[PDB]
Amino acid sequence: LQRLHMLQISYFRDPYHVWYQGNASLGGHLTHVLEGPDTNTTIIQLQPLQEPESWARTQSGLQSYLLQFHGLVRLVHQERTLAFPLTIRCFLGCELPPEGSRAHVFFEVAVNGSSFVSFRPERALWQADTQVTSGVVTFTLQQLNAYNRTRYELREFLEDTCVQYVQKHISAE
């Protein structure tokens, strides 16, 4: 519906062993799969939407996102008490409404099936979704809000890159 939605589920049995499963849909059709442990992560386009050189660039940046994501969970563990095993769910995307002056974009993170933090994209700030203050949540937010990587680069990815991908490829669906 002029939208790209991406889902990443990350199963941590311990800080150093993670299992990934995810997928992306474009206009409500499955277009990408994420699969495998950190030791060997498969990231696939089901439909050849990007040309080889282009997709290879996109794929390298996804792998790099994963490495930094994993580093942040180990850091939270390394600095606060983080109880494993745990499952993290990242749900993110962009939507072009027919009646919209702006894309709607989002990035929502849950832990163990409960709301944890989410991204306020235009101001490029992360917020807690948990009702109670927690050293884990507070420390995570401190990390997410302190660096350009998790603020301004992510805003660009959701507002610019995702939206330009929808405009460029929805007609294929």
Ligand SMILES: *[C@@H]1O[C@H](CO)[C@@H](O[C@@H]2O[C@H](CO)[C@@H](O)[C@H](O)[C@H]2NC(C)=O)[C@H](O)[C@H]1NC(C)=O
């Ligand atoms: C990723 O794949 C999962 C698994 O198929 C999708 O989850 C399904 O979502 C639909 C809603 O449209 C439900 O009817 C199913 O019950 C869900 N399945 C499971 C196992 O939970 C998910 O929507 C996909 N996400 C993308 C591509 O962004």
Ligand SMILES: *[C@@H]1O[C@H](CO)[C@@H](O[C@@H]2O[C@H](CO)[C@@H](O)[C@H](O)[C@H]2NC(C)=O)[C@H](O)[C@H]1NC(C)=O
């Ligand atoms: C996420 O869920 C798992 C399982 O539901 C939690 O693991 C439990 O942790 C407590 C204390 O660390 C143990 O007494 C239980 O036996 C564990 N259960 C299992 C199945 O291993 C985990 O602690 C949760 N983590 C967070 C951060 O919510």
Ligand SMILES: *[C@@H]1O[C@H](CO)[C@@H](O)[C@H](O)[C@H]1NC(C)=O
């Ligand atoms: C990684 O896993 C995929 C799963 O299909 C496999 O095809 C590929 O050969 C593996 N690559 C490695 C182990 O370097």
